[PDB]
Each structure stands twice: as C-alpha cells, then as structure tokens.
Symmetry: D5
Subunit: 156 residues, 10 copies
C-alpha cells in the first residue's frame, strides 16, 4: 500500500546519513544508480528526499550503502518535497538556478505562451539529465535538459 510523508526532516536526515555512508564508501551517484534501471538524476533525487524509489531499487541502493530496514522503507515513501532550506538558496551552485528564474522567468513565461499557449510546462511530467561537454572557447559547459509536457489552460 502506498505510504507518504508529511514532514521533510525525516527524509532529509536520512539523506545526510546516506551522504556520510556514500563518502565513507567513496561512491558516486552514477554507481549507486547503476543496476537500478533508473536514471542517475531520479535515483539521486530520491536519496536526497525528493522522489520515492520502488522497492527493488530501494533494496539495491540500501545494500550498496549499508542502510537499515527502516531507511530502506523510508526511501519508498512518497516524500514531502522541497529541498531548499528557506525558499531562496544560499549555496552559489544552487543559487545560479534561482538567478536564471530572476533573469529569464518572465521571458520563459512569454515564450511558453507564444509557442504553446495559455497553460504551463509540467514540473511533474518530467525527465532530467546533466551533461558535461567541452566549451569551444575553452573549458567545460553543462547541458541540462528538462523534458516536460505542455498542459493547456482552457476556458470552462
């Protein structure tokens, strides 16, 4: 039977536990997700309390990280999502994504309405991935793809 959380601190504390075990075992997120049949961003997000793992994947990551049974169960619960401590990130890495909203939020709105119509790009119907590639002017770049579904707002 599906089970859900209502207080984020339970799964966020579990996340800190997972991170220590991961560091102690010198593991990557890529290798923890290996063998789950699930994308690295989905599995990572679960570990960090923002998604629920199916039972088989919870058991597999739990074995990797030497987690107890209550931890393995908790990873299968539907989370109380929200990873930002207090609404606006303080961490520079996370902040940049917030800054994108500050600079391009209204442009994204305007061009979503022009290209798709009145409604939204779903934050629920998703796939997410992060790639590193060379920058042609030197150095490296991130190409992060958010693959969402347009959901129209229509009169009733």
């Amino acid at each position: 039977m599906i089970q859900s959380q209502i207080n984020r601190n339970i799964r966020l504390d579990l996340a800190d536990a997972i991170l220590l075990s991961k560091a102690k075992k010198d593991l990557s997120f890529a290798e923890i997700a290996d063998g789950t049949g699930l994308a690295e961003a989905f599995v990572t997000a679960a570990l960090l309390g923002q998604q629920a793992l199916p039972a088989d994947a919870a058991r597999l990551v739990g074995a990797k990280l030497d987690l107890d049974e209550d931890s393995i169960l908790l990873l299968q619960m539907i989370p109380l999502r929200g990873c930002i401590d207090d609404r606006i990130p303080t961490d520079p890495t996370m902040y940049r994504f917030y800054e994108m909203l500050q600079v391009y939020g209204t442009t994204l709105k305007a061009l979503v309405h022009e290209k798709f119509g009145d409604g939204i790009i779903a934050a629920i119907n998703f796939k997410l991935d992060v790639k590193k590639v060379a920058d042609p002017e030197g150095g490296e770049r991130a190409v992060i793809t958010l693959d969402g579904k347009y959901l129209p707002t229509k009169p009733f």
Copy 2:
C-alpha cells in the same frame, strides 16, 4: 558610453507599455526579434527589462512598437535585473520553474559537483532555449535546455 539602471521599476513600466503596443499591433516576440540579428529570447528579455539592447536593435524594435525616444534610450541601459515581483513567483507558468528548484536543486548541485567539480554553472555565460516537441502519446512536450559554463572553485 555605457549607461545603467538602479531601480527596476523604470524598465518594468516600459515593459508594460511595450506589451500594450505589442498587443494593439498584434505582434509576436518572433517577429519583433526578426531582423535584429539577435536571438528571440535575448530581444524578449530586453523588452521585459532583463537585458540591454544595442542602439540599432533598440531603434528597430522602437520603430516596430512606436516607442518614443526616451524609451529607445532606456532599452539600451544595462538593467537592474530581477523579474520576480516578490522572490517566489505567484504565476503558475513561472512557478513551475521555481518548483523544479524545490524538487531538483540539491540533485543539480550534487551532479554538477560529481560531473564537473566544485564551483558553479554560470548563468551569465549562458543561453536558455525552449523547443516544442510532439509527445508520442498525445499532446505537446516542451524541452527546455539550460547551457552554462562551468566555473571552478579552486583552493588558493
């Protein structure tokens, strides 16, 4: 000589005037940007107060929207950026981009550090893009790609 703003309200007011004229003339953002040599997201963002147009682009868009001379001048000013009214968007379309941060912000941090290292993905050396794609299962999918430069944080 470069000129810059310190109060966002001057350019956001101009954005509202620009959008009324745009509506009255039944124009798209695509056609406003057409002929400027500048990307539609860049020109859009400038009309909306979040980038500076070079003089020739400001004159071209100003002729298209029947803007006055002070307005064309204002569009060339480096803006006081920040499009969100009060920190967290109230608008559902814009809100989804905030919710993405709430769900995936720590995952984005985690994967950036794993794949690139310590530092940030910069959204000044950056361009965002929205593609319409047919969902193979009915409806339309927005693929939003975020491309920024990795700037490392290194010991000194």
Copy 3:
C-alpha cells in the same frame, strides 16, 4: 497572436475599474457571464485578472461594462496570475480557504497519494463552481467543487 502580461498590476488596476462600473450598473457576476458560453467562475476570474477571455467574450462583457478598446484587449491577454496581495490573505472570506490548507493540506496530500498515487491533482486542468444550498439546521451552506485531473509522477 497570443499576448501575455508580466506585471499583475496592469490587470488588477483594470479589475478595480471593472468593479466600479459594475457597481454603478448594479450588475451581478452571473449576469455579466450570461451569454458568454463560459462558467461564472471562469469569467469572474478573468475580470479579476486571473484568466484570459476569448475575443468574443471580452467584447460581450466589455459592452455590458462600457469598457474601452484597450480594456477589452487587456482582458484577452494571458495574465500574470496571483490574486493574493502578500501571500497570506488578510480578508476573512479569503482567509478561510487558506485556513482550509493549514488544517487539511497534509490530509489532502495523504489521501491524494492513497486514492490516485504519487503525483498531483492538476490546478491548470480545471473547473470550479460555487453552489448555495440550504443548511438543514437553519441558514445556508456553500458547496464548492474543484474538478481536476490526476497527473502521476513516475520514475525515469
């Protein structure tokens, strides 16, 4: 060509003009929405800045309210939605719906997950109606129906 707003105050200013004209004419929202083909709540929400009217409806309600051409155009724009002045309503009538969230939000989460699964009840895919019924104990009750769609969240 679709047109969109980015600062809520343009349409909220128009809303207050609408309400003054409506008061002088002694109009009801039911009568304004008469002949429109659209639900009372939908049209009312448009007048108040939170939905867009199709051109014919904008023309009709604009005739009823003696609106000028710019105002009729404004009602057809996709709004920057967000009706609450500063996040938490001050108005008692409005505040009761917020209090509903303070008391039942986590219950709504838990029951949505049990009945449907991981995901959301979609705020954009919608219909809303307010019905006055008799309270058998004396007085009246409001029955407010929120008719939404379940959108699942699934591993990838």
Copy 4:
C-alpha cells in the same frame, strides 16, 4: 475533561511515528478509519495532528498502529492546528491547493458575497472530501468538494 496543546511539534512528531508504524504494517488510511464511525478525512487529519479523536477512536487506531498509552492520550488532545511548515507549501501536491487560492481566491470571495452576502464560508463548520472519477477523455479526475456554513456579517 478536555485537554489542549499549544506547540504543534508534539503532535507532528507523533504523526511521523504514526506514519513509520503505518508503513511498517502496510496499512491504508481507509482501513485505519474503518470501525471508528468517523470520516476518513477526519481520522486522517487527527493522525496528522490537525483534529482530536474521541477516546473510543483513539484507542481503536492506537490498537491498529501499536501506539503507547501517551500517544493514544495525545491523539485525544485538541491540537495547535497548522500543518504547513512555513506558510506556503513547498510540496507540489499541497502547493496546487495554494495555487488555487492564488488564481481563484478573489473569485471565491466575489461569488460568496454575490450568492450569500457579506460574511464568510466557515472552515470549522466544514467538511472536505476527495472522490476519484475516470476522465471520459482518458485518466483519472479528482473531484474535491469543500462544504462550509455561511456565516453572515451584519451591522450592529
């Protein structure tokens, strides 16, 4: 004799324990409420810290969840209600109910005054329910019914 709480964290901590036990036993909220004579939304809200269970119900759910006597006593306390961590939900599932307020709050006010008069729809003399209904265009529709008493505001 009636007993009340003044800090929500006592009952919210109890909720987290209830949820871990419920998950360990793979129970649904529907079955926990079964045998209690009380609506599933009512009982669920109690477990989650937002309502008080009568003594018979507290004992009955306490038996099903293997709760100690202090916990069964706590469930009978009149709570310090307020389920949202910090005013605006971060969790997408709960956030959609907040967003309905941001889109429709003023419409709800305007139609309540039109149909009933000055005053409020109460959230104490109130019930809530959630029904699943197949969308005739594929998938599941969620109908949420909010039912409150009208309480007039009159001159004095």
Copy 5:
C-alpha cells in the same frame, strides 16, 4: 445587488479622504454615527474600510462629510478587509492588541477549549464596544467588549 472589492487600497484611500474631511469639519466618530441606527464601532470601521454601510447610513455619513457619489457608493461595497499595513502593527496603540495575543493567545486558546469546547469564538458573528471608565486606583480604563458566538468543531 451586492458589490464587493478585491484591492484594499481603494477603500483605504477613501478612508484617508474621509479623515481629512472629518478633521476639517472638526467632527467626532460618535457624531458621524449619530442618527445612523448603528454602533459607533461599526460605522467607524466602515469609514476606515473594514465594513460595508447599508445604503441609508452611507448617504447619511456622506452628507455629513461632503463626500462625492462614487465615495458614497464605495462605502456600500463589501470590503477587502485587512487594516494592518504589513501584518504586525508599528503603531503603539494598535501594537498593544497584538501584544495581548503574544502574551495571552495560548491561554485564550486553552480557556476557550475548557469553557466552550473545540472550536473557535467567531470574529464575525460579532459586536464591539469601547467604554472609558475610572480606574479605582486612579486614572482611566478602557473596557473593550468583544461579543462573539462560539462555533464548535465536532468530529465528522
């Protein structure tokens, strides 16, 4: 037909106008309410944007204050209530009532539940009067009576 407001600033601007007129005419609130059939606290709250005057009262006070026709109509509108500028009053005289809540809010909760039960004392089914009397120990006291109905919350 009943008319309502959605933005407090319209009625609060009018309240400032009413206060300048009242000051110019050197009137009291007691004098303004006299011959109205209505309690000074009700009429005063209406002038200050927090209640709706019935038509007869509105024209009466309108004549006294030399108000224009739009102003007399505005006074009959159901307000967007909320008199505090930003949530916590800055004014010492207003602050003291806020401080009563900070010191005695939980005691008020506890004693309401003991004396009446689970529920609220409605702040709507109300009447309010302020009296000045001698303090037996010297000086003057305010006796402020808040007469409201208990509305129970019962299991459902």
Copy 6:
C-alpha cells in the same frame, strides 16, 4: 532574588510536559488554579510560559502535576514572553484574535484616541476574561472583555 529567562524555549518545553501530565491526570485549568489564590487566567498563562508563579503557587502546582524541582524553580522565573510560534497564528482558535486586529485594529485606535486621547491602552496593567453566555438564538456566545489602563502620551 528575582530571576528571568531570555530564551522562551526552556519554558515552552516545560509547558508541553505540564500539558502531558495534566492530560494524564485528567485535570482542568480551573482545578489547577483552585487553592492557589491566583486567577485561572494568570495561573494558566504561567503554566504556558507567559507569567511567573510566586514560590508557594509554583510548589502547589508542582505537587498537583508531579513536577520535579528544576521545573518548580523554572515556573518562578520571569519569562521571555511570546507564545506565537512565528508571529501570525496558524491555529484557528488563536487566529480569530489576530483577525479581530486586522478588522478592528484601526477602529480601536480611532476610538481610543477619541475617548481617551493620545496614548495607549496598556497590555501590562490589564486583565482578560472570557465568559459563556447562551445566545437568544441557540448556542453559546463568548463575551470576551479586555480591560486595560489608559496611559497618555503628552507633549514635553
């Protein structure tokens, strides 16, 4: 020697323990205060961290509630007052007192200046009392009286 607190949490944690004991013993606040010579509102407020008990009273209530010695001493401390978790109550019962300020705060100020002059009604030389009175129309009325000293502000 008088002793005072600077962190409310010490007294608020004690309040919770007090409340658990009270419930385990099925005591009322009336009965806890009976025998102490001290008003029920004062004794209750002290238990909940908002007033200081004299030593004898602290011992009397400590006996009744089976409290340890550090707890009996803590009840005698002058508290760091402030019972609201975060400024605006989430609890419906307490929120109603906040709502009364949002509706009537400016009217209270206006009538206080009219009746008394410039200054305040003191929340310190003060007593609050709650009295049950059946409504003529069925059900109960809460008549709540706020009685406070007027303290003038005069030119210097």
Copy 7:
C-alpha cells in the same frame, strides 16, 4: 475635537515636504522648536510624523516653514506611528540603535527585572534627549537618555 490618522504615508509625505522647505530656508530643528515651549525632540518627532502638535505650536512651526492650512491641521493629528520603512533600518545612523537592541536587549530585560521587577519600562510615559559631550580621549560623544516609567506586572 481630537483627530487621528490610520495610514502613515499622509504624515510621512508631509514630513518630506517640511524637510525641503526647511532646507530651502536653511533652518535647524533647534530654531524651529524655539518659541513652542516644547522640547526639540518632541517637535522634531511631530514634523517627522511621530507626534501630534498642539494647535499653537502647529501654527507657529507652520508659519516658519510656510505650510498651508491643511498641513497645519495634519500636524495636529494623532499619527499612525512607525518611522522605519520596513522593520529593520537600512540607514547606518538609525541602524546603530537597532544594533544596541541586538547586543543589549536581553541585558536590558534582565536588569530591568532585577532593579524594578516584572513588567516594563514604558515607551509612552517616556522622554528622550540627545546631548553632545566632549570625549576625554579626543572627539565627541552622544549621550542619549531614555527616561521612562516602570510599570509593574503583578499576579492577580
């Protein structure tokens, strides 16, 4: 008859106009207060929207500053007090007094209780003066004296 304000911006806008006229006339607050028979700090506070002038003082200062009759009437109103734009000062000069509270607030409380007892030092029965005193080790010191009455909080 006494008159009062409910929106600080009326008196604050007047304050700014007073300040321009004062600067145009190259006047000091000392000189403006000369002849009123009222303290510098009181009269200054009045001009800045935080006290009420008696009529004669208001006519005197109004003559010095060439205020119209509406302005002189406004200066006699009991203000809606609160001079800080948004709770915490941004101005360094004003900020230092806030910093004094951050450093010494709990010490002030502790010593007040030790020296006087439970209660407060009033901020209404209160006079203030700023005095320049030569500093022995070079420079100037300000000695700000806060002179207010102890108001006990007693059991009842």
Copy 8:
C-alpha cells in the same frame, strides 16, 4: 590568542545553563559582577552571550556559578552577537526599546546629524547603564543612558 564564535547557539545555550545555576543559587547580576572590576551591564551581557569576559572575570563568575572549564573558556570567546530570536522582540520588556526605534528613530537620526554631523553614534565604543529613580508623581522611573562616540562620515 583570541578565540571567536560563529554560531550564536553555543553561547546562548550556555546562557540558559548559567541562568538555571544563578536561579538555583538565588544570585543577582549585581552580585555576580562584584569583584570583577567591570560594569554590571557588561558582565551581564557576557553571561547572556553578547560580550566576551577577560580570563580573570570568567574565572571569578565561573567560580560563583559553579561552571565547568569548557564553559569558563566559552565565556572568553568573542561572541556571534545578536540576542533577538527573530529580529523583532516578542517580549514586552524588550519590545519597548524596539518601539522607541519605531517612534523616535528618524528623530535620533535628524538630531544626531544636526548636533554632530554626517556619520553615526557608535554602538561599539558604547557604555550603557540602567538607573532606578523615584517619580515625583509616584512610582519608579528607569533612566537608561546610551553613551556612544560620534564617528563622522566625510567625503573621500
């Protein structure tokens, strides 16, 4: 070698421990500071986490309060200063000093600039003291003296 804190909770937790000890020994702040060579307000502020004691004074108060060696060491650390839980005090006694800022903050600025010039009165080079004085109208008066150095702001 000087030692400094960066998280206030270490020293604030220590202050609570000190206060329980002080209460258990029925000591005053005046007694605690005797023999220290330091002003009562300074020593008290140190115990409460807002100043650092010299080693000899830390040892002396440590002995009086029966503090362990880590605690005596902690008292010598330069604190992370800021005694207000959340920016605006809830406690009435502390709140009065905040209200003084809200009433007189702009007057303080105005008179400081007039008497001294552009710059600030220091809250670092700062001595303060609380004196009890009888009121010739009856009762007791607090005279708080804030004695700070003037620090000018000049062009560069």
Copy 9:
C-alpha cells in the same frame, strides 16, 4: 545648516532623473566626478542617494546634468541610506557582493578578531575601490579593495 532626509524615495527618485540626464548626455561617472576633488565612488554614491555632496560639488554636477535648484539642494542633504530595494539584491552584479558575505562573512569575522581583536572594521571610516587588471590567462580581473578602520570593543 546641515539638512537630512528620512525617506529614501526622495533621493532615489532624483537618482533615476539623474541617470536619464546622464544617458541623454552620454556621460560617464568618471566625467561627472571630474573637477569635484572627490573620488569617483564617492560622487557616484551621492548621485545614487547614498552620500551627501558638499555645496560646490553639488553645483558642479548639477550644471553638468542640467538639474534644477531643488535637486541640487537635495544632493547636499544627508541621505537616508540603503540602496537595496528589498534586503537581498536581485541583480546578478550586485548579488555577487552579497554572496561574498554568505561564503566568507564568518571568515572575515574570524580573521578580523584574530588580527585586530574584538570589535569591528568600520563601514563609515571606510572607502572602497574597483581596479581593472589584465588576466594573464585571458580577459579582465576586477580587484575590489575594501579599506576600513578597526574599532575595538573593550570591557567597561
């Protein structure tokens, strides 16, 4: 006679007017400061409402920018300082300085106490400067130098 402001909006409005004239005349901040005797950052801060200009400097910049007499007088007023619209900058260029605080603020504290002792680095007895330097690895380095006087906190 020294003159001072109490509401930042007067000088911030003037700043926007100044910036428009500066843009129309195609002037640099270096050119505006030319001839004044005053550092670029000091004069720029004055134009932007954060510093007062000596009269001769005000007259000079006023001539260049074609400002009226009232405006030239306003620039001589001691401002109500604080340039950030709402506490945390939204603009990326300004934000980086805030983020420096979030990353290195506790380090700055720690190293300041180590090198100098207890107290502060003043922002009054203070100047800053921005210098351009070539990056040998390509492009340009900005070296920002913060130079402030150490002001000790000593026991009293």
Copy 10:
C-alpha cells in the same frame, strides 16, 4: 570520488567543535593554515564550512585539532555554502560588510558596468586576503582584497 553536502548544519556543527578544540589549544587560524600550502582565508573558510580541503590539508589540520576520521572526511566534502544564520547578519562585525552593500551596492554595479561592461565580477573565481595595516592617523586598518574575474554578458 568527490562528495558533497546538502544541509549546512552538518559542517556548521563540525565548525563549532573545531572552534572549541582550537580554543582549548590556544591555536590561531594562521598556525592552523601553516604548512598546508593554502591561504589563511581559504583554510579558515573550510573549517567554517564554506570551502572543501584537499585530503592532505584535511589530514594536517585534523592532526593539529585532534579531529576524528569522520571529521577529516567531512572537511573534504564540497559544502552547502551559506554562513549567515538568517540572511542579514546580526553580529556587528559581519553586519558592517552587509552595510557596505546597502551603501555602495548600486555604486559598485554602476562602476563595474562603466569599467568592465555588462556582466558580473564572478564571486567564485577568487582570492581574498585580509591585511592589517597601520593607520597613519593612529590605530589600525583592515585592507580586504577581493580578486575576481570579469565575466561579460553579451547579446546573442
């Protein structure tokens, strides 16, 4: 394999422990950083949770401070940065750097755009150092150098 944190409290708790150990050994930040090959501000920031140490540095500082293996592992994790408890520093020493932003933030923006162009000085590409200098007029000054790369924002 690189490891990263998502909850600052883990590293901030470590920082408090480091600071107690450091005080017990009477250590300086200079001596702790000696021998690491890394700058004082960099190593200090790492101990304080705002930078990550390489393995050899982490082992070296951990030997000087008698840290356990888990703590040495923690120091090597990329942190969740953000040292300010709640956005605006309460501590005077840290606050002065915030005040620098409030006075000069817009000047910094304006002069960055004039000297460099549109874009940012990157708060990541960094070295900072704090230098103690003789003040010619008497006392000491802090010279703080922020050495960052200009990152332009260009049209596209």
